[PDB]
Amino acid sequence: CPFSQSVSQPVDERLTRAAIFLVVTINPGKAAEVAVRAHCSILSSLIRGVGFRISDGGLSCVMGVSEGGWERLFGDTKPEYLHVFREINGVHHAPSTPGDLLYHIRAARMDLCFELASRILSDLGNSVSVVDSVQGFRYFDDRDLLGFVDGTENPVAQAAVDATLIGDEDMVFAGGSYVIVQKYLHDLDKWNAIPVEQQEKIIGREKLSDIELRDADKPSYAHNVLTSIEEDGEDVDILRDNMPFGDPGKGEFGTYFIGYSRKPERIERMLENMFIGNPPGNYDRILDVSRAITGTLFFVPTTSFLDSIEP
Amino acid sequence: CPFSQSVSQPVDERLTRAAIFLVVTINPGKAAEVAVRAHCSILSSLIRGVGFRISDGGLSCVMGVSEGGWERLFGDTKPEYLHVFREINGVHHAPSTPGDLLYHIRAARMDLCFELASRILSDLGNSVSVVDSVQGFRYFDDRDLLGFVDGTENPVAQAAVDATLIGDEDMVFAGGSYVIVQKYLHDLDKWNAIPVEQQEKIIGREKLSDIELRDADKPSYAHNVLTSIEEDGEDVDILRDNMPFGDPGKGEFGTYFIGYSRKPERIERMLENMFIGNPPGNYDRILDVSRAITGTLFFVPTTSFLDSIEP
Amino acid sequence: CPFSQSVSQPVDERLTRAAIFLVVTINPGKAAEVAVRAHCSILSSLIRGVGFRISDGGLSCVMGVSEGGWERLFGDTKPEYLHVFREINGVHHAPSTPGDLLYHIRAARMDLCFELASRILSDLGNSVSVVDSVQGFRYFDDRDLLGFVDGTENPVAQAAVDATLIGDEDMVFAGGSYVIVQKYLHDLDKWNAIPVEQQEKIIGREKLSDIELRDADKPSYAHNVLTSIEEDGEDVDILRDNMPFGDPGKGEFGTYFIGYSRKPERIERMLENMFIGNPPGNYDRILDVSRAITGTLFFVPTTSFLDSIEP
Amino acid sequence: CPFSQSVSQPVDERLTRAAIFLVVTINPGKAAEVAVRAHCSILSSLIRGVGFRISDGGLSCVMGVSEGGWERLFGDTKPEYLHVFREINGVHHAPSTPGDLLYHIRAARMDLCFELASRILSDLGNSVSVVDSVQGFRYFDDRDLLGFVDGTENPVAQAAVDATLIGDEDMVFAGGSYVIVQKYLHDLDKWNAIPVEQQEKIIGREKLSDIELRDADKPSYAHNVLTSIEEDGEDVDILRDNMPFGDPGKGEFGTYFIGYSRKPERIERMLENMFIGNPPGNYDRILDVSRAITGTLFFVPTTSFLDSIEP
Amino acid sequence: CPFSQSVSQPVDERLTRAAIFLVVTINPGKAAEVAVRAHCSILSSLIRGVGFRISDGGLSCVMGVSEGGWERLFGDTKPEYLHVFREINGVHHAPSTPGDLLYHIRAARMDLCFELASRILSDLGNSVSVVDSVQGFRYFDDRDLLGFVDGTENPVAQAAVDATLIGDEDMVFAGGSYVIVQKYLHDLDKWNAIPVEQQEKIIGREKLSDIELRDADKPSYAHNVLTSIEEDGEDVDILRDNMPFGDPGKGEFGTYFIGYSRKPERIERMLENMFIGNPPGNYDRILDVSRAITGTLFFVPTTSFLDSIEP
Amino acid sequence: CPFSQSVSQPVDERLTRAAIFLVVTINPGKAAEVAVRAHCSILSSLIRGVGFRISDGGLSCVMGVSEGGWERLFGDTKPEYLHVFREINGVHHAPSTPGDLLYHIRAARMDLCFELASRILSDLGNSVSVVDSVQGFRYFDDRDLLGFVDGTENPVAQAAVDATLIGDEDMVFAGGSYVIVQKYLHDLDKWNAIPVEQQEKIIGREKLSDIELRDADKPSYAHNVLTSIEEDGEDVDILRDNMPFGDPGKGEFGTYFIGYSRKPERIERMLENMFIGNPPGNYDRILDVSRAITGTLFFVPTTSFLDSIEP
Ligand code: HEM
Ligand code: HEM
Ligand code: HEM
Ligand code: HEM
């Protein structure tokens, strides 16, 4: 019975009022690998120490390893579906970016994430180089920067566990997951110039009432229509924890999309439908106001596996 | 009876869990001045609209105008003590930076400050250029990044009103104030290498217990000793709302110092004592781990005066 | 593994600060049946949409179908214990009232229940006719209008699951339940004229201390004595969520009794003991100040069964 | 220094999550007048007793007396502006309804208002007859049933005191106020069929962002334009505490408008502008979906005056 | 304008969930007096330091000096009404106990009071000897150990200020107050054996409903009747903050009565009415189940006076 | 499936803001045993009644029986590891104290524990004699009186269940546990005189940051090093709920250590390592400032076993 990381529990508990996405790369050399492998076993103790002081803080941290990082750190067989993120070249472009270790830190207060990230980076020292560091926050009542409520159709409780945690398909990694991260920059002026009814149709839900739309009223290019896919005749869901972020001073507004799954094929299919179009040419209008500049895939191993690594 | 801005009330209410310091400069041309003057009268309506939706949000915004901005916008006589911030050249350097308008936004949640700053910048458009935009947050239990509780000796209720709000010295501006803003970048590795007793003596208070030290145990260069000054034989206090800020990914850690007063002479004297030393050469050791890179002085007029400007 | 509705979880979580009981009847005609069957599959999506926006809202909705409604909607075999509620003619009368669909909506705030009920009724349109619509609220510290704490002896966690959810007795409906609803109108003047010790003995517990009474001090007609019944030599419990309601202007005060079980025989036996008396003539004095005007029985199917209906 | 009732303090404190408007008429006979006059002096003790038990409950009650009630109860000179509410016959009709005593009860929980109203009605007994009894609740984030945030432009702190409390114009009643109550029933289907931009223009603010509109974009019949009036060249504000209410089962949806002032002439002018039109024929479109069925004017005396009445 | 201590503000704010009453005596010798006089000026700094860390903690501390302590510490003229507490010998006995300094510490959490008391005692060292140290806590919903709600008839806001703070009767001490402290030990078995109606009549209010009783139903020996006294034909109120306390293990149950006034004559008259009887022989039945073992009177000077003492 | 008591659930839920440890002895005679056996079956009903009224109160009570109490009450075979606590005579002394029944009461408020303890003692009457009664409270942010965060390394969720609840080693008592209680009195003056770095090394963690220390920096006598033991090559954890307590007036400061386990051998080994030393002579320095005066071992049976006892 391998203990799994806090992947779906924080979402269901619904306490993440602040988050930090930290994508770092391992510097060349064996010493950096040794330092990272040593810090792997103490990550859990750091998590407990940093978040025990602030009760009801909901502090959690998910560590993910990409294909290159896993090749550099653990040379044993890799998971079945672990591979470099595939770029998509359709009506829009989804680039692939370097990354070896992903730290997704969530807490009910920003200071907890700040302290945990500072401790992690200080312990890692010069062994890693920070590639991306995004500080996301909950915007109003679970709304994103486009004004629409996000996260409604996420699976809850047992459904989330069945959708994210890997079963017996890859026993040697039972309890792991696959995470896909992307960063979108929004064109708020263009979105705001769009009439409210057009946004109504594009998203496929309602703005204020957050109630869905009837199948007779949702066009073929609705966001929730293109992202609805099925396997073996049954609909399969993924866990999303998109977080708004930005800096007003530089005029930067964006959303950090993060998706957990037991199979990255589902998320890749959803990305293909959104970018290439299903059928081709029928792309999602959301990409007309949102630009993707960062995208990567990581593997999330079990907590016991992390605690079982010897330097 | 001129209505004063929310200068001391937010501090006493103690609800600022997040803040944004936005220092912008007015672009050359009369059109930019006209746009700023028009937005001046609608700032209050924007504040009310943005912060009424989130009850117990504690949203407040203080707008300050520097000497150059006041000269460009209102050509009538200026306040008595409004002048360009004086740089200090002692054992350390405190630079002076350009700035025309200061927006100090405070709220119990980050999203309110985000929305207010975005609305203000969108309304201002191209008339202003953003010089500095710092997002500060409350760190643990009112502690700064150095680990010491900050804000203990702030005046409360009537004392704060008497210390910040201008009396009859400049009737034509009764209800205004002077605000001095600085940005400090910390060297946390050097501070952490310092023994706990040395930090104990340098700050002049205790770390955990936050209790003061006896006058027989505080050296002449204690931080709370050098910052204690008197006028006409009576001690005079200032209102401080320093806010920690930073980005772990770039390794940036700092504190945004903000000080309100009825007379900037007090804050300038405190800065002279800290940097030059009282007596000279006996500087505060805090500057040995903190570097000042931004410093400016602004004037905060009354709410009625802001509402009374005609474009 | 059929997913069960939120029957016992809201009670154990203890967040229902407001509730709406909506008993409606299906209008004659096949079109109304088709509309209800279509709305059955979208009820869950409506629930999620309406209650995701208000975090920690605890919004839940239980839909129940009576014998006539089940006969009109699904013509396949009915559950084993689904039948028209039996009226009781003893010292008091418990009438039976028409009803086809029951909506029990619970939330921590009244507005969520209001929005959900409005959406449900708007979607149903003219296909249904509202028979009863009662808005109940939590009165002080879980007290009913008679001044006594109610809900103390409810089963918690696993006991509630074993008492409410149907096991293998009716496999084809595993995960369902039976719900019995009644509406009582109180005579508060008569109850208040009764001495505190007489109410002490009638209820069988204490008023303020909410502690029980010794078996030597509880008469044979104590409320908690007559409602304590056993099956096969073992005591069996039922889940109750009685909610006070009323309108001061019309002088209307009452309690909405709702009871969930895996077998309605237990609740019917409890009703027989309370009304007819055990032994006959030894009725509960609570009925001397409370009048029952509405009573109905419904069947609560599983969430998966509701989602699996095709129009 | 006459102590004033909690007229503006509850609004500024912003804790009214539930309210009850109870309009009753005094039955003919001297005994009813004597009973009401006796209960007048014990109303404050009842208020304290009922609301002291639930800390942070924010329980308050405002008692108002109409012209007829004041004539029947106190035969001394009446306030200057106390008169029967004037009906308005323009494009829409605003009826006048009987009423002698008004009880506006507000609390953070519904049960407190329930208990206070029940106690008041029980103490009054048969001396009064209930004419209207409306239970209002806060809908989502201070939004009314039309989906727009209401209460943004209300005066706060000293402005509210100067707008509601009577000064020296009628010394003998210093500290009193005038309250105008109306009940509106909404046609939600017609409002919802209206496009979002048309509602945008009709209300004069924005829906989600709750930010105002520029004077170049608000038509002459915007709701906030017609309700903006001035006295002696200065804009004068009134205090509004409109509360949504309704029953889904009967399909009843409405808003209870309540307005406090030091002079009812302002509210009457606002009503004339909304109904007759300014200029005539340019009425507010809100009345096209809202029907007024109840409207009355009451006088709110000081707490000391209420405590000083001898039976 | 002398600043007054937090005497009435904590009660009106209603945040005291825990309190510590510490009555200590000054050891003989001039050194103890010097140490106490030195700690007097740093008490405020200690208060701020100890309670700034726990936001919304509501930490306050009132220091009072008795007649002997004032004679030993300050040899200048004493307040007009400062004298040794007078023992009362009627049907019951109210003893007088030694005491020089009184510390009434209040906070929303017990740990704050613990820390403040520990710091005060550590700073005082051997200069003082602890006579009494009682840890009181709020019992349920502002109820005392007898089951009745206490504190309902306390003056609020301006009335409390006028009742507690000394006016111009003793200018040299404007802003001070007089505090009377007593400790009562309850006989809960005897009180519980008393019927609920007899307790109803003895207290003079209701138990659950906390509503008063009509003057025709309250006997002459009701607790709220004997404690209602008038000066110059006008009723005068006092501020009470009675706190339940006890230890179950030793079977000790009691109430710590504390009363603030601008004139101790009112509290002494109330004590005479309760113990001797008004008329004599008509004593309060509360003393039949409560025994007084400690009683003392102290003077509370202004905060500025405390800060102005030089060792 | 025997239902287990609330042993690990309250700790994981993290709501114990107040606790009472009540160690009592059974008086000689069969009547006392009969009374205790009768109260055993009603303890659960008392718990539910006392803690249902205060929602989110987190009230729980654990009843434990020592070897002598179990011999006097139930004469059937005892658990495998139930025995009298063994005193330890090394560099320090850990005494053994009499005790028959242990009541560990926990709640989010002190009043709930007070009421429950009072009810339990009143029901027990003269059948038991109170030996120890300690009222503990949470000190600041889960810190003990020594200033270090305590409870960080406690097992959570499934690990706690596996560490505390007895498996199949003693089937007849499956679901029980063993609890070891000790009372330590602290010498705060000696601890405070110790430099912060020496406390840093003695505890083995950090004070403010609550982060652990590297194995190269923790000496052999670190507290967390000596208390880390293994069974069969695997580390085994125990559940600790130490609670600070004391009385400032008497200068009494201490910590009540409580430890739950499926095997008391682990706790006895930890005590031997701390007191005797591992290797001998290398004792924990914590005992140099803390004195143990009370120590006892009890057995905690299942809830079903308690409910199944017949008087
Ligand atoms: C800036 C980027 C995006 C934004 C602002 C956005 C926004 C939204 C919103 C508002 C909804 C409806 C609320 C809900 O269903 O919970 C939604 C639905 C959804 N989106 Fe996105 N989305 C973005 C990108 C993506 C991407 C890249 C994916 C997958 C690779 C994705 C997958 C989904 C899924 C699975 C749903 C649920 C629809 C359903 O279950 O019917 N989204 N999105
Ligand atoms: C206006 C109607 C009623 C009121 C005010 C009322 C009130 C109460 C109260 C105050 C208690 C004790 C608190 C508690 O046990 O949690 C209780 C117990 C109980 N009542 Fe009711 N009751 C009503 C009707 C009913 C009905 C109609 C039934 C069943 C058909 C019922 C079944 C029970 C049960 C099972 C218990 C638990 C007793 C035990 O477990 O020993 N009640 N009731
Ligand atoms: C164990 C001791 C006492 C207990 C349990 C107790 C309890 C109560 C209670 C329950 C009330 C009604 C609640 C309220 O009026 O707020 C009350 C009223 C009052 N008591 Fe006490 N009391 C005690 C001793 C005293 C003493 C010694 C005094 C004065 C020296 C006093 C002065 C008052 C006053 C002024 C009132 C307000 C009555 C009114 O305003 O009409 N009490 N007491
Ligand atoms: C006054 C007495 C004691 C105090 C103040 C104290 C304090 C502490 C502190 C601050 C920690 C580190 C925080 C943590 O690990 O959660 C700790 C660790 C621990 N202590 Fe204690 N302790 C005391 C007595 C004991 C005793 C008597 C035992 C066992 C019989 C014990 C067993 C443990 C254990 C198991 C740990 C966890 C260490 C680890 O998992 O590596 N403690 N103690």
Secondary structure of E296-311 as H, E, C letters: EEEEECCHHHHHCCCC
Read off the tokens for E159: 């009335």
Please list the residues that pair with A137 across neighbouring strands: A18
Nearest to E210 among D3, D53, D55 (CB): D53
Helix (H, G, I), strand (E, B) or coil at E130: strand
**Domain-located, residue A48:** yes
Read off the tokens for D121: 């009605």
**Cβ–Cβ contact B118 with A under 8 A:** yes
Output DSSP code: residue B173: G
Q: State the structure-solving technique.
A: cryo-EM
Using a CB-CB distance cutoff of 8 angstroms, which residues of chain F are in contact with residue B147?
208
Amino acid at A67: E
Amino acid at A91: V
Using a CB-CB distance cutoff of 8 angstroms, which residues of chain A are in contact with residue D141?
141
Give the ligand whose atoms come closest to the C-alpha of residue E270: 3
Read off the tokens for C293: 């005007």
F261 pocket-lining for ligand 4 (C-beta < 6 Å): no
* Disruptive mutation site among F50, F53, F123, F302 for chain C (greatest number of C CBs within 10 Å): F53
d(CA B229, CA C109): 53
Do C and E share at least 3 CB pairs under 8 Å?
yes
Helix (H, G, I), strand (E, B) or coil at B249: coil
Greatest distance between any 2 Cα atoms in chain E: 60
Please list the residues that pair with F185 across neighbouring strands: F254, F291
Q: D298, D102 in Cβ contact below 8 A?
A: yes
List the one residue out of C238, C306, C245 whose CA is nearest residue C270. Answer: C238
> Which residues have C-beta within 8 Å of that of residue F308, sequence separation ≥ 6?
F41
Read off the tokens for A36: 């990272």
F101-107 vs F60-65, strand pairing mode: antiparallel
CB-based burial of residue C58 (10 Å sphere; 0-12 exposed, 13-18 middle, 19+ buried)? buried
B128-137 vs E234-235, strand pairing mode: unpaired
Read off the tokens for A136: 């996301």
E219 C-beta neighbours (distance < 10 Å), count: 12
F2 HSE (CA, 13 A, CB side): 21
Q: What is the DSSP string of C90-114?
A: SSSEE-----SEEEEEEESSHHHHH
**Count of domains for chain B:** 1
CA E256 to chain centre: 7
* Dihedral sign (CA A222, A226, A231, A232): positive
F129 pocket-lining for ligand 4 (C-beta < 6 Å): no
Q: B43, B97 in Cβ contact below 8 A?
A: no
HEC readout, F227-285: CCCEECCEECCCEECCEEEEECCCCEEEEEEEEEECCHHHHHHHHHHHHCCCCCCCCCH
List the one residue out of E46, E3, E69 whose CA is nearest residue E303. Answer: E3
**Cβ–Cβ contact A118 with B under 8 A:** yes
- Show the domain range for D232: 9-307
**Domain-located, residue C101:** yes
* Dihedral sign (CA F166, F172, F176, F182): negative
3-state DSSP percent of chain F in helix, strand and coil, to 5: 35, 25, 40
Q: Do E208 and C141 touch (CB under 8 A)?
A: no
Angle at C243 between CA C242 and CA C244, to 5 degrees: 125
Torsion, CA F205, CA F209, CA F214, CA F220, rounded to 10: -10
d(CA A141, CA A139): 6
d(CA C21, CA C13): 20
A228 pocket-lining for ligand 1 (C-beta < 6 Å): yes
d(CA C35, CA F127): 68
Closest chain A residue by Cα to residue B121: A248
B311 C-beta neighbours (distance < 10 Å), count: 11
Q: What is the DSSP string of C248-275?
A: TTTTEEEEEEEEEES-HHHHHHHHHHHH
C71 C-beta neighbours (distance < 10 Å), count: 13
Please list the residues that pair with E107 across neighbouring strands: E18
Q: E58, E253 in Cβ contact below 8 A?
A: no
Read off the tokens for A229: 């896919």
Using a CB-CB distance cutoff of 8 angstroms, which residues of chain B are in contact with residue D153?
48
**Cβ–Cβ contact E196 with C under 8 A:** yes
Residues in chain A: 311
> Which residues have C-beta within 8 Å of that of residue F156, sequence separation ≥ 6?
F12
D280 C-beta neighbours (distance < 10 Å), count: 11
Residue E157, min C-alpha distance to chain B (Å): 16
d(CA C80, CA C85): 14
CB-based burial of residue D250 (10 Å sphere; 0-12 exposed, 13-18 middle, 19+ buried)? exposed
> Which residues have C-beta within 8 Å of that of residue D140, sequence separation ≥ 6?
C53, C54, C111, C115
**Domain-located, residue D236:** yes
Terminal C-alpha separation, chain E: 24
Q: B183, F184 in Cβ contact below 8 A?
A: no
HEC readout, F176-229: CEEEEEEEEEECHHHHHHCCHHHHHHHHCECCCCCCECCCCCCCCCCHHHHCCC
E88-89 vs E93-94, strand pairing mode: antiparallel
d(CA C98, CA C129): 11
Atom of ligand 4 nearest to the CA of F152: 16
d(CA B226, CA B213): 14
C129 C-beta neighbours (distance < 10 Å), count: 13
d(CA C63, CA C40): 9
**Domain-located, residue B83:** yes
Q: Do A52 and F210 touch (CB under 8 A)?
A: yes
Q: C212, C200 in Cβ contact below 8 A?
A: no
Q: F56, F65 in Cβ contact below 8 A?
A: no
Residue F59, min C-alpha distance to chain A (Å): 18
Amino acid at F143: R
Report the neighbours of E using a cutoff of 3 or more CB pairs below 8 angstroms: B, C, D, F
Cα F226 to middle of ligand 4, angstroms: 9
Question: Given the structure tokens 């474009």, which residue do they identify?
Answer: B311
Using a CB-CB distance cutoff of 8 angstroms, which residues of chain C are in contact with residue E208?
147, 207-208
Cα F150 to middle of ligand 4, angstroms: 7
E275 C-beta neighbours (distance < 10 Å), count: 20
**Alpha carbon nearest to ligand 3 atom 41, residue:** E224
CB-based burial of residue E211 (10 Å sphere; 0-12 exposed, 13-18 middle, 19+ buried)? middle
C89 C-beta neighbours (distance < 10 Å), count: 10
d(CA A216, CA D282): 39
Read off the tokens for E131: 């006579």
* Alpha helix (H) residue ranges in B238-302: 264-275
Residues in chain D: 311
Please list the residues that pair with E149 across neighbouring strands: E143
A151 pocket-lining for ligand 1 (C-beta < 6 Å): yes
d(CA A36, CA F97): 50
Using a CB-CB distance cutoff of 8 angstroms, which residues of chain E are in contact with residue B141?
53-55
Contacts of F204-211 with C-beta under 8 Å, sequence gap 24+, read F205/A49, F205/F148, F205/F149, F205/F152, F207/B208, F207/F147, F207/F148, F208/B147, F208/B207, F208/B208, F209/A49, F209/A119, F210/A49, F210/A50, F210/A52, F210/A53, F210/F148, F210/F149, F210/F152, F211/A46, F211/A49, F211/A50, F211/A119
Helix (H, G, I), strand (E, B) or coil at B260: strand
Helix (H, G, I), strand (E, B) or coil at B211: coil
d(CA E186, CA E180): 19
**Cβ–Cβ contact F52 with C under 8 A:** yes
**Cβ–Cβ contact B141 with E under 8 A:** yes
Read off the tokens for F34: 């009969």
Q: D291, D188 in Cβ contact below 8 A?
A: no
* Dihedral sign (CA C154, C160, C163, C164): positive
DSSP H or E run through F105:
strand F101-107
Cα A4 to middle of ligand 1, angstroms: 25
**Domain-located, residue D156:** yes
d(CA D105, CA D142): 18
F1 C-beta neighbours (distance < 10 Å), count: 8
Question: Given the structure tokens 């005082």, which residue do they identify?
Answer: E124
Classify each residue of C18-43 as buried b or exposed e, where b means 16 or more C-beta atoms within 10 Å of its C-beta: bbbbbbbbbbeeeebbebbebbbebb
Q: F59, F47 in Cβ contact below 8 A?
A: yes
Q: B51, B116 in Cβ contact below 8 A?
A: yes
List the one residue out of A88, B209, B19 whose CA is nearest residue E45. Answer: B209
d(CA A37, CA A42): 9
**Cβ–Cβ contact A147 with C under 8 A:** no
DSSP H or E run through C278:
none
Q: E62, E9 in Cβ contact below 8 A?
A: no
Amino acid at A188: L
**Cβ–Cβ contact F129 with A under 8 A:** no
d(CA E267, CA E88): 13
List the one residue out of A235, A157, A199, A212 whose CA is nearest residue C49. Answer: A212
Residue D138 Cα distances to B112, C109, C267, angstroms: 21, 9, 37
Cα E296 to middle of ligand 3, angstroms: 18
Read off the tokens for C114: 């209001």
CA D157 to chain centre: 18
CB-based burial of residue E56 (10 Å sphere; 0-12 exposed, 13-18 middle, 19+ buried)? exposed
Helix (H, G, I), strand (E, B) or coil at B266: helix
If phi > 0 it is left, if psi is from -120 to 50 it is alpha, else beta; for residue D201 that is alpha
Question: Given the structure tokens 């910590």, which residue do they identify?
Answer: F255
Read off the tokens for F74: 């139930």
**Alpha carbon nearest to ligand 4 atom 15, residue:** F153
Q: Do the annotations mark residue B240 as ligand-binding?
A: yes
**Domain-located, residue B1:** no
Using a CB-CB distance cutoff of 8 angstroms, which residues of chain E are in contact with residue B211?
46, 49-50, 119
Atom of ligand 2 nearest to the CA of C238: 35
d(CA E284, CA D216): 74
Q: Do A142 and C50 touch (CB under 8 A)?
A: no
Residue B144 Cα distances to B141, B218, C143, angstroms: 9, 21, 47
Given E100, E132, E144, E150, the catalytic residue: E150
Read off the tokens for F252: 């009494």
Closest chain A residue by Cα to residue B143: A111
d(CA D180, CA D239): 11
Amino acid at F199: Q
- Rg (alpha carbons) of chain C, rounded to whole number: 19
Q: Do E140 and F246 touch (CB under 8 A)?
A: no
Read off the tokens for B16: 């600022």
d(CA E78, CA D60): 43
**Domain-located, residue C2:** no
Amino acid at E54: I
List the one residue out of F310, F257, F2, F218 whose CA is nearest residue F136. Answer: F257
Helix (H, G, I), strand (E, B) or coil at D307: helix
**Resolution, Å (one decimal):** 3.3
d(CA E296, CA E86): 9
Catalytic residues of B: 150
If phi > 0 it is left, if psi is from -120 to 50 it is alpha, else beta; for residue F237 that is beta
Closest chain C residue by Cα to residue A151: C52
* Alpha helix (H) residue ranges in D125-154: none
List the one residue out of B11, B131, B6, B7 whose CA is nearest residue B68. Answer: B131
Q: D182, D257 in Cβ contact below 8 A?
A: yes
> Which residues have C-beta within 8 Å of that of residue F252, sequence separation ≥ 6?
F185, F246
d(CA B189, CA A237): 46
Nearest to E207 among C195, C197, C208 (CB): C208
Amino acid at E89: N
Q: Do A210 and C46 touch (CB under 8 A)?
A: no
d(CA F182, CA F256): 6
List the one residue out of F119, D32, B37 whose CA is nearest residue C212. Answer: F119
Read off the tokens for C296: 């109905």
Output DSSP code: residue F128: E
d(CA D307, CA D41): 5
Q: Which residues of C are documented as binding site for heme b?
A: 151-153, 223, 240
d(CA A133, CA A135): 7
d(CA C244, CA E181): 43
CB-based burial of residue C217 (10 Å sphere; 0-12 exposed, 13-18 middle, 19+ buried)? exposed
Output DSSP code: residue F83: -
Question: Given the structure tokens 């030597």, which residue do they identify?
Answer: C216
**Domain-located, residue F30:** yes
> Which residues have C-beta within 8 Å of that of residue A92, sequence separation ≥ 6?
A275, A283, A287, A292
Residue F41, min C-alpha distance to chain C (Å): 12
E146 pocket-lining for ligand 3 (C-beta < 6 Å): yes
E44 HSE (CA, 13 A, CB side): 18
D61 C-beta neighbours (distance < 10 Å), count: 24
